Amino acid sequence: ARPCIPKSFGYSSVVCVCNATYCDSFDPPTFPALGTFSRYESTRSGRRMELSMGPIQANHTGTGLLLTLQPEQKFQKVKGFGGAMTDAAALNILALSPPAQNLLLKSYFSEEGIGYNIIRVPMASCDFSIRTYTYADTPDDFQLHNFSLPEEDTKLKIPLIHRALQLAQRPVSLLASPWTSPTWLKTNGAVNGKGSLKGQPGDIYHQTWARYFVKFLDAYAEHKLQFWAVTAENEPSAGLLSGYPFQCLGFTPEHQRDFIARDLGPTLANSTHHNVRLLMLDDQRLLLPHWAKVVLTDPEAAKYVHGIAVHWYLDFPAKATLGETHRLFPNTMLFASEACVFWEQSVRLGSWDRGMQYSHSIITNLLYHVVGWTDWNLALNPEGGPNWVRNFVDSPIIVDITKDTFYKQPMFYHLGHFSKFIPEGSQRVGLVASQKNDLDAVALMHPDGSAVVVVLNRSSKDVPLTIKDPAVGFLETISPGYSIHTYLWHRQ
Ligand SMILES: *[C@@H]1O[C@H](CO)[C@@H](O[C@@H]2O[C@H](CO)[C@@H](O)[C@H](O)[C@H]2NC(C)=O)[C@H](O)[C@H]1NC(C)=O
Numbered sequence: 001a002r003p004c005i006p007k008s009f010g011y012s013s014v015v016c017v018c019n020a021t022y023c024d025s026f027d028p029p030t031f032p033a034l035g036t037f038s039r040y041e042s043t044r045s046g047r048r049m050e051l052s053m054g055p056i057q058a059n060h061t062g063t064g065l066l067l068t069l070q071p072e073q074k075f076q077k078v079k080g081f082g083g084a085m086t087d088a089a090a091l092n093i094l095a096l097s098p099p100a101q102n103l104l105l106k107s108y109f110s111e112e113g114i115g116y117n118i119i120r121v122p123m124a125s126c127d128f129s130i131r132t133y134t135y136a137d138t139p140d141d142f143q144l145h146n147f148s149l150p151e152e153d154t155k156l157k158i159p160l161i162h163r164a165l166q167l168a169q170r171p172v173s174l175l176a177s178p179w180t181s182p183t184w185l186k187t188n189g190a191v192n193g194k195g196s197l198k199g200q201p202g203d204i205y206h207q208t209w210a211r212y213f214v215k216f217l218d219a220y221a222e223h224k225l226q227f228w229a230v231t232a233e234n235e236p237s238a239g240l241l242s243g244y245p246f247q248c249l250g251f252t253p254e255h256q257r258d259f260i261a262r263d264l265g266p267t268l269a270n271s272t273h274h275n276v277r278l279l280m281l282d283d284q285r286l287l288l289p290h291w292a293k294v295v296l297t298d299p300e301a302a303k304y305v306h307g308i309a310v311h312w313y314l315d316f317p318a319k320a321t322l323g324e325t326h327r328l329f330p331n332t333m334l335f336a337s338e339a340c341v342f343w344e345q346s347v348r349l350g351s352w353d354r355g356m357q358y359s360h361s362i363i364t365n366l367l368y369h370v371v372g373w374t375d376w377n378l379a380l381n382p383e384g385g386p387n388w389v390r391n392f393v394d395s396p397i398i399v400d401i402t403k404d405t406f407y408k409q410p411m412f413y414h415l416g417h418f419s420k421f422i423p424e425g426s427q428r429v430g431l432v433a434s435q436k437n438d439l440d441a442v443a444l445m446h447p448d449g450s451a452v453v454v455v456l457n458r459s460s461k462d463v464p465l466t467i468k469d470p471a472v473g474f475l476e477t478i479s480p481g482y483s484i485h486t487y488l489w490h491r492q
């Protein structure tokens with residue numbers, strides 16, 4: 001309905017300006033007939049998911065590269081895509097006028113937007129908060145009688161989660177992850193630094209921490225929010241590093257294996273939230289497949305673990321990490337739970353490179369059995385904050401409080417090229433390249449049988465392209481240099 005208002009900030013591409021009265025949006029999706037495809041195109045030159053249509057032809061005449069859909073070769077099914085509503089994301093969204101807040105929320109979650117369906121909710125504070133806190137800071141409260149949600153949850157996060165669910169056409173899945181426990185349950189008595197849980201799995205300390213998970217789900221159930229899954233600990237390897245700055249909690253793979261078997265697993269099972277999934281690792285895929293062997297070999301731990309959560313930092317091979325983990329444990333899903341972008345500035349408004357970084361990593365993960373991808377902060381300020389430590393990073397939406405204006409980065413549209421067109425339940429199918437190429441392509445099949453194919457060109461040269469669907473025909477197109485396309489078409 002409304003196109004992108006571009007602004008350049010000196011980098012390789014533009015941002016899309018939005019405010020209280022204007023933001024770019026989509027019309028409700030339509031169903032083009034058989035023999036017709038839909039194409040969404042974003043380019044470094046300024047095009048932003050521009051819709052166009054064309055024919056799927058009976059035969060093909062050309063000398064160029066050919067991609068052939070192979071629908072009979074079926075792989076993993078997709079859980080969904082989204083981001084994390086941290087304290088920082090909530091503070092930056094709510095700093096806008098209410099009309100602008102809704103245009104930001106509609107951008108992510110509405111079908112007028114890119115249709116997110118996963119929100120990662122941190123349990124208490126992390127580095128993207130403006131203060132250290134947990135839900136049970138008063139010490140020696142082992143039954144957790146003084147467990148309570150602060151204003152960060154009751155005033156900021158939960159209301160915004162509600163409004164995002166109202167605007168979403170698709171069911172949204174909430175995913176919780178803890179950063180640190182109460183300090184009186186840790187070895188070093190600090191919110192950060194090198195330290196684990198006091199004692200050994202099964203004692204008063206590990207039991208108290210396991211029910212902290214239940215008391216968290218209780219508090220959100222009271223606010224009428226149910227969770228799809230929780231992770232055992234956000235980056236538990238970080239809590240083993242000497243002098244770690246953010247909130248953390250140390251777990252060796254054997255420690256996480258025992259804490260799941262003796263405490264977290266049974267406690268969540270004996271509770272009203274027994275249907276909530278438990279994901280392990282929630283760390284860099286570097287620690288794979290070793291972390292999967294330690295945990296999933298113990299049947300008393302593996303009986304409770306529904307999947308493995310991966311972070312995308314420390315990636316700069318996938319077949320040795322994601323692929324080998326799948327080969328050893330093919331029935332334990334892999335899920336990208338966090339992602340975000342040394343000499344470079346924290347925020348690079350309009351960076352087309354960081355957009356490509358998102359889409360390429362999404363394509364790689366999809367090609368190696370990952371069932372979903374989650375972004376980090378939903379929104380940040382032009383300095384990459386607020387962050388109480390220092391860790392400023394980038395975000396697909398940057399908020400300018402002083403001008404009631406937020407910018408949609410190229411990262412936003414690169415993820416949207418997946419999140420908007422690959423609904424929960426889609427299955428990845430084969431896509432054969434006729435010859436070596438510079439493109440990254442992934443083919444999936446909607447639950448309704450239709451096809452979806454994302455093609456990203458990280459090279460500077462235009463690549464002529466043909467997509468073959470054996471049931472339909474030949475799709476003639478061109479993938480321009482520095483562009484990403486999403487193709488959709490019905491198969492009958
Ligand atoms: C919010 O964004 C919209 C979109 O750019 C702004 O509306 C434009 O205003 C300029 C005036 O400087 C007109 O020339 C454009 O034609 C308008 N675009 C439209 C109507 O689509 C709006 O001004 C912005 N808000 C503020 C306070 O500046």
Ligand SMILES: *[C@@H]1O[C@H](CO[C@@H]2O[C@@H](C)[C@@H](O)[C@@H](O)[C@@H]2O)[C@@H](O)[C@H](O)[C@H]1NC(C)=O
Nearest residue numbers: 056057058059060061062470471472473474
């Ligand atoms: C697509 O084309 C095939 C080859 O067509 C023949 O060769 C080309 C070079 C032209 O000379 C053309 O006039 C010839 O008929 C066809 O045999 C094939 O049937 C066509 N496929 C479909 C689905 O129509």
Ligand SMILES: CC(C)CCCS(=O)(=O)C[C@H]1NC[C@@H](O)[C@H](O)[C@H]1O
Nearest residue numbers: 126127128235246313338340391393
């Ligand atoms: C300062 C650290 C020593 C950098 C390395 C570890 S890290 O995991 O890459 C940080 C990322 N993941 C954890 C999030 O809380 C954090 O905000 C995000 O930037």
